[PDB]
Design a protein around this nucleic acid. Structure first.
Ligand SMILES: [K+]
Ligand SMILES: [K+]
Ligand SMILES: [K+]
Ligand SMILES: [K+]
Ligand SMILES: [K+]
Ligand SMILES: [K+]
Ligand SMILES: [K+]
Ligand SMILES: [K+]
Ligand SMILES: [Mg+2]
Ligand SMILES: [Mg+2]
Ligand SMILES: [Mg+2]
Ligand SMILES: [Mg+2]
Ligand SMILES: [Mg+2]
Ligand SMILES: [Mg+2]
Ligand SMILES: [Mg+2]
Ligand SMILES: [Mg+2]
Ligand SMILES: [Mg+2]
Ligand SMILES: [Mg+2]
Ligand SMILES: [Mg+2]
Ligand SMILES: [Mg+2]
Ligand SMILES: [Mg+2]
Ligand SMILES: [Mg+2]
Ligand SMILES: [Mg+2]
Lengths: 101, 99, 82, 114, 127, 151
RNA sequence: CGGUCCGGCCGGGAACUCAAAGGAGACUGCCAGUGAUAAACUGGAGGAAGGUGGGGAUGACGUCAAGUCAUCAUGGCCCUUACGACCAGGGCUACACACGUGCUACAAUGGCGCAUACAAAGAGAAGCGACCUCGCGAGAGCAAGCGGACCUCAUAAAGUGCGUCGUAGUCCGGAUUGGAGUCUGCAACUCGACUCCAUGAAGUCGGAAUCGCUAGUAAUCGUGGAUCAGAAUGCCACGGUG
């Protein structure tokens, strides 16, 4: 199980849309040569570090939604390979039948 | 003007009858109906491991086919638009209208 | 390597080093930040950088400016096989 | 024929023969012959001497032959005495750029001794 | 009138129109020698009009799509065959014996799971 | 091939001449499915034989082909743990195949510049009954008439 | 067919390719011969296809106390100021060696330079990102279009034509290392991918032995996708030559 891993993951998700995709302006914009070429850009580069170590979209492991498995993820369904198979055979994923071409 | 209707579905019989329901209800208000045209179907494939552990060559291959139909209406009287916006089809069809 | 658009150094290390060059050299400055560029500002001070279990002290000469701190604290122990 | 590059390249096309000069590859050789106004399907034969030292001090504009070797080796000595990570790998004989060392480091470690 | 034929090979598709009484072979608004640089493709396209003989007795306007050189050449052959069969209706019997009428149905085989190719198997070793 | 006996597969003639034999030759010379390369090489070598040392341009090939074609072969047959080398007659098509293969493999292991002129020398000396394709034939024979008692 | 700026680009056409729904077609159905008046075998015709047309999915009763308590679920056992929980740094990338599976080579059926042909199948909104300008280049700036048979990824490579190299450890090979950079990312020391300049190991076809493949197959040449901020010689797919 390791429920605590799921807790870590959901905390990272929430805190990450908490800060970023809202305050990306500290790097996406102020780094521009047209924004600064001097102490302003340096002050922004150092300000980007006091935001928590989380809150980056680059720290989500993107686990399964039912069992929380790290590996074998499928972005289309949000499930691991095991769960998409066990649910596809039961007939719950629409339109997903066995392919043979 | 022209009004354009795009129909997407996961099976072809439901979307076939949905396109019917559209194109005769368009002729019911006496309108010219261009189509219906089958656009190419988009089939997305997936390949999964089927053991819980350590069995790399044992796999399953699934696919989802999306069927696409297009219909254009080129002589809309006012009783054609409402006459198309009142129509009841089962849940498998997604319609997108374009003015 | 990194972009020329700004070298990297942490905030806590930056403040610790400025206050240590104002206040005269001191204890081996204990740090964990192996990722920070060595600046001209601390030639002469002794920084004890973490290597996983210990803090290896390094005395910064002028040749070290531009390198990272972690380059001067090896993380793995190994001395022959047999 | 001798150049400022002290070596003596042999009688083949000039763009290839000037690469026997240590520190000059193919791009440098093309730049050399383009600044000298010399085509590069010309041999070291069939060439003037009032065309050879225009090459000689056209190539004198680069860091070349033994003076390059010194520049390289002291850049290695620097690391080897700095005590850095690249220095530890240079001073010992293991790959420096982060390659696998469990297997397949035979170019850096030489033929295998059991 | 136009006499028309459709021909297909591995992944190519060729449509062929033949007109009476002139010598133009034109494919994709190009000569035969401009299009097919390989004389084997040039030979394959002239095959059906060698038993069914001509000097310059019909001109043919061809277009092709898909595939490579051999696929397009074979598609054009098959299309010429079908077109001239619509033209005469009784050149069929000797074209059957030449093998020009059968649509070559060899398609490239799919790659299969666990295999490096359609049939090439990974190197096995006992231990 | 336990049960399913096989027929044959079609082969095109050659654009330039209209031969099946030489079309077999370029399939045996082709490597990696590069047919254009092999056609180029074989035309380049064969004209190089014809007007440098030679006849009407198809005859000059068959005269070198006949003098390397073997007439008898060795095939081995097991006892209970012994295998006799029994000499056997070679069938026509296998004769042409063996000749073409030996010519190609002798031409492959020479020391000259092109492949066309390597092929050229080998075919020229096969016309003169020397080289190493012809001696391949000579010693397959030698071994066949050494085991002449096991017919 | 008309017109044209010579591009299906406009009028226009619904023929053709194609798209995707429906339908037809192959059944030893037909004709000979053999066969136990058999079931079936050889051959022929017609036909796009002939004898299971090609490929796939489909894996009987059971075997190996085979594998997985680390996907999940679960009987019993064990921990409960720690075998639970949070954080920073490190490690999973170590290196005397041995083995398995791959990629690149040892060259002329080739290497390099210039010119020029012919694909299929896919993906895309915190996404794909054109045109133009700057940079030798990786890329940067500006910014259109696209939830897509429309826009982008994206100018396929082997191939063909011309020139050169002329059998060399080479104009083969591109490992290793030095310097200078780009981009993603809080952050590229340990430990990322890519670019430029320079460096140019081994390697000249591989012992005993051993593997795959019966036709669009083997061999070879490129393309795409999932995972994914970035990071394939792996995996899963696609066509070309053959
Ligand atoms: K050089
Ligand atoms: K390593
Ligand atoms: K349990
Ligand atoms: K680590
Ligand atoms: K590999
Ligand atoms: K290997
Ligand atoms: K070289
Ligand atoms: K990625
Ligand atoms: Mg990630
Ligand atoms: Mg690595
Ligand atoms: Mg293939
Ligand atoms: Mg495998
Ligand atoms: Mg029609
Ligand atoms: Mg069955
Ligand atoms: Mg067990
Ligand atoms: Mg076990
Ligand atoms: Mg366990
Ligand atoms: Mg940690
Ligand atoms: Mg590991
Ligand atoms: Mg050699
Ligand atoms: Mg078989
Ligand atoms: Mg290759
Ligand atoms: Mg690929």
């Amino acid at each position: 199980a390791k429920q605590s891993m799921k807790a870590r993951e959901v905390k990272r998700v929430a805190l990450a849309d908490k800060y970023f995709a809202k305050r990306a302006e500290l790097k996406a914009i102020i780094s521009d040569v047209n924004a600064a070429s001097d102490e302003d850009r340096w002050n922004a580069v150092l300000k980007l570090q006091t935001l928590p170590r989380d809150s980056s979209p680059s720290r989500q492991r993107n686990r399964c939604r039912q069992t929380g498995r790290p590996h074998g993820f499928l972005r289309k369904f949000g499930l691991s390979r095991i769960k998409v198979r066990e649910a596809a055979m039961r007939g719950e994923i629409p339109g997903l039948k066995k392919a043979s071409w | 003007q022209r009004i354009r209707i795009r129909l997407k579905a996961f099976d072809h019989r439901l979307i076939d009858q949905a396109t019917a329901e559209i194109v005769e209800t368009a002729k019911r208000t006496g309108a010219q109906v261009r189509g219906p045209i089958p656009l190419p179907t988009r089939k997305e494939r997936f390949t999964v491991l089927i053991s819980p552990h350590v069995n790399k060559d044992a796999r399953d291959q699934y696919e989802i086919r999306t069927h696409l139909r297009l219909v254009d209406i080129v002589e809309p009287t006012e009783k054609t638009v409402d006459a198309l916006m009142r129509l009841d089809l089962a849940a498998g069809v997604d319609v997108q209208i374009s003015l | 390597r990194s972009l020329k658009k700004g070298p990297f150094i942490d905030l806590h290390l930056l403040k610790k080093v400025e206050k240590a060059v104002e206040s005269g050299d001191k204890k081996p400055l204990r740090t964990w930040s192996r990722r920070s560029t060595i600046f001209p500002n601390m030639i002469g001070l002794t920084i004890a950088v973490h290597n996983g279990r210990q803090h290896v002290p390094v005395f910064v000469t002028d040749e070290m400016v531009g390198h990272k701190l972690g380059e001067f604290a090896p993380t793995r122990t190994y001395r022959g096989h047999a | 024929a001798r150049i400022a590059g002290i070596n003596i390249p042999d009688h083949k096309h000039a763009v290839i023969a000037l690469t026997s000069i240590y520190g000059v590859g193919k791009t440098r050789s093309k730049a050399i012959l383009a600044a000298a106004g010399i085509a590069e399907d010309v041999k070291i034969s069939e060439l003037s001497e009032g065309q050879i030292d225009t090459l000689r001090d056209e190539v004198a504009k680069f860091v070349v032959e033994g003076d390059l070797r010194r520049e390289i080796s002291m850049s290695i000595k620097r690391l080897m005495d700095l005590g850095c990570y690249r220095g530890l790998r240079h001073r010992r004989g293991l790959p420096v750029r982060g390659q696998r060392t469990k297997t397949n480091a035979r170019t850096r470690k030489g033929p295998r001794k059991p | 009138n136009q006499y028309y034929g459709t021909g297909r090979r591995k992944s190519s598709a060729a449509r062929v129109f033949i007109k009476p009484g002139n010598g133009k072979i034109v494919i994709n608004q190009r000569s035969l020698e401009q299009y097919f640089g390989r004389e084997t493709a040039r030979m394959v396209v002239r095959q059906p009009l060698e038993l069914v003989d001509m000097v310059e007795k019909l001109d043919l306007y061809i277009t092709v799509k898909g595939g490579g050189i051999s696929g397009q050449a074979g598609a054009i052959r098959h299309g010429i065959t079908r077109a001239l069969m619509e033209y005469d209706e009784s050149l069929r019997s000797e074209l059957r014996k030449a093998g020009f009428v059968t649509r070559d149905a060899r398609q490239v085989e799919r790659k299969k799971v666990g295999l490096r190719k359609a049939r090439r198997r990974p190197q096995f070793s006992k231990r | 091939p336990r049960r399913r006996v096989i027929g044959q597969r079609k082969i095109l003639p050659d654009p330039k001449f209209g031969s099946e034999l030489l079309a077999k030759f370029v399939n045996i010379l082709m490597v990696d499915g590069k047919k254009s390369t092999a056609e180029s090489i074989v035309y380049s070598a064969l004209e190089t034989l014809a007007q440098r040392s030679g006849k009407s341009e198809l005859e000059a090939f068959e005269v070198a082909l006949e003098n390397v074609r073997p007439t008898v072969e060795v095939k081995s047959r097991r006892v209970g743990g012994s295998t006799y080398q029994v000499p056997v007659e070679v069938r026509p098509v296998r004769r042409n195949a063996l000749a073409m293969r030996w010519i190609v493999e002798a031409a492959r292991k020479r020391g000259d510049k092109s492949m066309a002129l390597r092929l050229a020398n080998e075919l020229s000396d096969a016309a003169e009954n020397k080289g190493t394709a012809v001696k391949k034939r000579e010693d397959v024979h030698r071994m066949a008439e050494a085991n002449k008692a096991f017919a």
